[PDB]
């Protein structure tokens, strides 16, 4: 079994701050798997920050940024989409359990 907790959330922030998360992730040999469904994921989330209050947590895999699939996308490009968005970001993530 793979228990999936999917959420799609909107982050809104001032310029004096970040969204409050570390994004990590990778080649071309990645094949999406229930255990590991995406390339980029959240390494940590600032508990006192914006991405935490919206429900993002350590270990969330990033599925969609601002409406676009980023399952197979590389770190620099995903970071770019996120940076284009400015002070708002719509992201879809999944948490995998068991």
């Amino acid at each position: 079994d793979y228990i999936i907790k999917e959420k799609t959330v909107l982050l809104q922030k001032k310029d004096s701050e970040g969204f409050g998360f570390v994004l990590r992730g990778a080649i071309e040999e990645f094949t999406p798997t229930p255990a590991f469904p995406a390339l980029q994921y959240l390494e940590s989330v600032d508990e006192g920050g914006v991405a935490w209050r919206a429900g993002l947590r350590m270990g969330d895999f990033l599925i969609e940024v601002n409406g676009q699939n980023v399952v197979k996308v590389g770190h620099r490009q995903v970071v770019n989409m996120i940076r284009q968005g400015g002070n708002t970001l719509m992201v879809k993530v999944v948490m995998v359990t068991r």
Binding site: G18, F21, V22, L23, R24, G25, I82
Partner: peptide, 5 residues
């Protein structure tokens, strides 16, 4: 890679 956002 890693990036604080």
């Amino acid at each position: 890679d890693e990036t604080n956002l």
